[PDB]
């Protein structure tokens, strides 16, 4: 027994021993699935959670306008008034937000941007990033995927 609400993302939530459900449009974990917005928002097992899936090295050359195309599963369609998708990258301690597009439930793309980083001897920089929607609803990234900027 415990507060399902303490789980911050879907995968932790549905894997809880507390017996919890994830509300994908409200972005919260609950013991009572009736607190989700509607039935289709209720996630009960990990395979149904929104998540990025394993992919080969995401390689973006510095100083060139490029999109970043990410493979996923179960990405939610925003409800009325909810904001869409963004990529949030931490590059050497600074946060960059890039507009993104959900092409479908299995594909999200950070839209065209150029990227830079400091360091003449770093030929390939691993960058922490999140895909979010509605400002701060984070998509689970269980394989710990990184963006790799390269020189
Ligand atoms: C924790 O769960 C109890 C129900 O067992 C509830 O009364 C309380 O509001 C919950 N707290 C939070 C912060 O969700
Ligand atoms: C993205 O940027 C490249 C390079 O500037 C450009 O050639 C391409 O047309 C752009 N694509 C979109 C969809 O804006
Ligand atoms: C999802 O969108 C991408 C990009 O447009 C496309 O390549 C892919 O085939 C789509 N997948 C499905 C199942 O529609
Ligand atoms: Cl919901
Ligand atoms: Na969500
Ligand atoms: Na992942």
């Amino acid at each position: 027994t415990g507060n399902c609400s303490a789980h911050q993302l879907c995968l932790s939530c549905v894997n809880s021993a507390f017996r919890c459900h994830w509300c994908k449009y409200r972005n919260l974990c609950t013991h009572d699935p009736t607190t989700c917005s509607f039935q289709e928002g209720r996630i009960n097992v990990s395979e149904d959670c929104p998540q990025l899936v394993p992919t080969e090295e995401i390689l973006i050359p510095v100083g060139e306008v490029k999109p970043i195309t990410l493979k996923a599963r179960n990405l939610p369609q925003p409800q009325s008034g909810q904001r869409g998708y963004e990529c949030v990258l931490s590059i050497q301690g600074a946060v960059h937000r890039v507009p993104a597009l959900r092409f479908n439930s299995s594909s999200v793309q950070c839209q065209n941007s150029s990227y830079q980083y400091d360091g003449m001897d770093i030929s390939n920089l691993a960058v922490d990033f999140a895909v979010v929607w509605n400002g701060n609803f984070i998509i689970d990234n269980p394989q710990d995927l990184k963006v790799h900027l390269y020189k």
Side-chain angles (χ1 to χ4, degrees), residues 9-10 22-28 37-38 40-41 49-52 73-88 97-102 108 130-140:
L9 273 78
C10 185
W22 183 254
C23 303
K24 73 180 174 188
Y25 306 103
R26 299 195 65 204
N27 204 248
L28 58 82
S37 281
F38 51 97
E40 193 273 329
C49 283
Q51 55 194 288
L52 305 187
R73 297 285 183 277
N74 314 302
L75 297 180
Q77 182 172 31
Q79 306 307 95
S80 298
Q82 290 184 310
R83 281 173 271 165
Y85 283 76
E86 295 173 78
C87 300
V88 183
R97 303 184 70 101
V98 182
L101 277 180
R102 177 192 180 277
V108 60
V131 172
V132 304
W133 66 286
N134 199 32
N136 62 357
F137 294 181
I138 305 169
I139 302 300
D140 282 332

Side-chain angles (χ1 to χ4, degrees), residues 92 117-123 151:
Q92 300 176 315
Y117 67 84
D118 215 356
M120 67 174 38
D121 291 295
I122 294 171
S123 57
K151 285 182 178 183

Side-chain angles (χ1 to χ4, degrees), residues 26-95:
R26 299 195 65 204
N27 204 248
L28 58 82
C29 188
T30 182
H31 196 71
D32 184 351
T34 75
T35 62
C36 302
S37 281
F38 51 97
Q39 289 154 314
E40 193 273 329
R42 296 163 187 177
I43 305 300
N44 312 307
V45 297
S46 66
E47 293 85 2
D48 290 338
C49 283
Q51 55 194 288
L52 305 187
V53 295
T55 185
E56 298 172 2
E57 195 175 10
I58 297 159
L59 284 153
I60 312 290
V62 298
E64 303 182 23
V65 172
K66 293 287 190 178
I68 305 175
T69 308
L70 305 162
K71 300 165 62 177
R73 297 285 183 277
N74 314 302
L75 297 180
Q77 182 172 31
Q79 306 307 95
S80 298
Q82 290 184 310
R83 281 173 271 165
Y85 283 76
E86 295 173 78
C87 300
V88 183
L89 305 86
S90 277
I91 301 173
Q92 300 176 315
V95 182

Side-chain angles (χ1 to χ4, degrees), residues 69 102-109:
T69 308
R102 177 192 180 277
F103 284 127
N104 48 52
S105 68
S106 54
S107 178
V108 60
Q109 181 185 78

